[PDB]
Amino acid sequence: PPISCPENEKGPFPKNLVQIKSNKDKEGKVFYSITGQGADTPPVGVFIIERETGWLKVTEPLDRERIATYTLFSHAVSSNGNAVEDPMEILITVTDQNDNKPEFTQEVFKGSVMEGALPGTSVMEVTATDADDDVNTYNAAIAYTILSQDPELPDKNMFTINRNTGVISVVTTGLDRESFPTYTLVVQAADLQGEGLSTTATAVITVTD
Amino acid sequence: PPISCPENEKGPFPKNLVQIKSNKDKEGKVFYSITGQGADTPPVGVFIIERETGWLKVTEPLDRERIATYTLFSHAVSSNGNAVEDPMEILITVTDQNDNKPEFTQEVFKGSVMEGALPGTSVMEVTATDADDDVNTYNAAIAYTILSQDPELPDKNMFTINRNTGVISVVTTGLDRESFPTYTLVVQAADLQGEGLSTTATAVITVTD
Numbered sequence: 001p002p003i004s005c006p007e008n009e010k011g012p013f014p015k016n017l018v019q020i021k022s023n024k025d026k027e028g029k030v031f032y033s034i035t036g037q038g039a040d041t042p043p044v045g046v047f048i049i050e051r052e053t054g055w056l057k058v059t060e061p062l063d064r065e066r067i068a069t070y071t072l073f074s075h076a077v078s079s080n081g082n083a084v085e086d087p088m089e090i091l092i093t094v095t096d097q098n099d100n101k102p103e104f105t106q107e108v109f110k111g112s113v114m115e116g117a118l119p120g121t122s123v124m125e126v127t128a129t130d131a132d133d134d135v136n137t138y139n140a141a142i143a144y145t146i147l148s149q150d151p152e153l154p155d156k157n158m159f160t161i162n163r164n165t166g167v168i169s170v171v172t173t174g175l176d177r178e179s180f181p182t183y184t185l186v187v188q189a190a191d192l193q194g195e196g197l198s199t200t201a202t203a204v205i206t207v208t209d
Numbered sequence: 210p211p212i213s214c215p216e217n218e219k220g221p222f223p224k225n226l227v228q229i230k231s232n233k234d235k236e237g238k239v240f241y242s243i244t245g246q247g248a249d250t251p252p253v254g255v256f257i258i259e260r261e262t263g264w265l266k267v268t269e270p271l272d273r274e275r276i277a278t279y280t281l282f283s284h285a286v287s288s289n290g291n292a293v294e295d296p297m298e299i300l301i302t303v304t305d306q307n308d309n310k311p312e313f314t315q316e317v318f319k320g321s322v323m324e325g326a327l328p329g330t331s332v333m334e335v336t337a338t339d340a341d342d343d344v345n346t347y348n349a350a351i352a353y354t355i356l357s358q359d360p361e362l363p364d365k366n367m368f369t370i371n372r373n374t375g376v377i378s379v380v381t382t383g384l385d386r387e388s389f390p391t392y393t394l395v396v397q398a399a400d401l402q403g404e405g406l407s408t409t410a411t412a413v414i415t416v417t418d
């Protein structure tokens with residue numbers, strides 16, 4: 001039956017995952033071993049099996065973003081030296097931890113907005129990614145916010161950002177490129193729908209006629 | 210055979226966990242049910258089992274910090290209405306996500322320190338806890354930092370904090386009650402050994418004669 005193990009586990013190692021058993025203990029003594037990537041081919045020895053007990057262990061932390069599944073085969077051999085069964089497939093699923101912060105595709109996004117743009121007009125878009133597991137978890141679920149605006153004139157909150165899409169809009173009036181030529185917004189992306197790990201970048205908006 | 214499920218999974222629900230079998234299905238219909246806290250006692254219906262297929266399922270997201278291990282029992286009953294097995298114990302392990310910030314044990318810690326205190330002199334100790342899995346993960350592994358000091362004289366950094374223990378110490382010279390009787394530090398606790406979710410509190414230090 002399929003086995004799962006979280007990434008990034010603390011020691012001590014090794015750690016038991018499951019005990020393999022041949023119904024062919026009828027033959028007395030069986031010796032167990034495993035093959036596959038993560039066993040006897042690279043990366044070698046991430047999993048091992050106790051020869052006599054059949055205990056299948058993990059020997060170090062896993063990393064879902066590097067390898068997310070392993071396919072091993074367990075072998076069972078008599079003391080006279082013959083395989084007593086065909087190799088049995090084992091499937092190991094690495095489950096995700098929130099160990100990647102969202103990462104903005106650029107450090108500085110640049111856009112422009114026209115004087116007299118209607119309140120509610122889209123201006124530009126910022127984008128972050130998150131390497132964590134977006135299928136099974138919220139570890140990659142990104143909310144966008146604005147942290148600050150420089151300058152704070154003529155109003156402190158000239159703009160808003162859609163917390164899902166990262167589209168920035170102008171939401172009030174009084175753009176004037178001859179007094180305040182640009183706006184520099186610090187934007188944040190945070191996973192767990194905004195409550196999780198975060199980073200920031202900058203969006204710089206040029207005011208046009 | 211031992212089963213696990215991450216907390217806080219996305220749907221859709223329900224999700225298959227494992228299929229229970231009796232080798233008594235040779236004879237005819239077996240009907241499957243489960244008892245225990247999480248099944249028929251509180252919280253009720255978190256796990257169900259398909260009567261015919263014996264597919265054990267989970268019906269909603271789990272919260273490890275509510276219940277981290279469930280002990281259920283599977284029952285198997287002939288279509289004529291007799292138990293064809295002893296009830297069989299099922300252990301479900303709920304594996305952790307980092308969804309709890311550290312939390313200081315109080316919002317304001319107090320300490321005092323002689324103005325004639327040598328650099329390296331312990332002043333006080335702040336303390337946080339984290340409800341996540343401190344045994345298997347780093348999701349509750351807290352690192353303490355200082356974020357701010359007030360006032361910022363005679364130096365901005367009159368104190369340092371032990372990353373691991375939260376012990377605060379005098380780091381430099383010039384403690385003087387009459388000029389500055391009171392320092393107010395903002396301290397922070399963050400999990401994943403400092404890289405993770407974070408909270409802040411305050412330490413208020415009095416300079417004594």
Ligand SMILES: [Ca+2]
Pocket residue numbers: 007062063064065066099
């Ligand atoms: Ca990882």
Ligand SMILES: [Ca+2]
Pocket residue numbers: 007064065096097098099100131132133
């Ligand atoms: Ca991850």
Ligand SMILES: [Ca+2]
Pocket residue numbers: 098099100101102130131132139140191197
């Ligand atoms: Ca993430």
Ligand SMILES: [Ca+2]
Pocket residue numbers: 216271272273274275308
């Ligand atoms: Ca939880």
Ligand SMILES: [Ca+2]
Pocket residue numbers: 307308309310311339340341348349400406
């Ligand atoms: Ca935590």
Ligand SMILES: [Ca+2]
Pocket residue numbers: 216273274305306307308309340341342
């Ligand atoms: Ca948790």
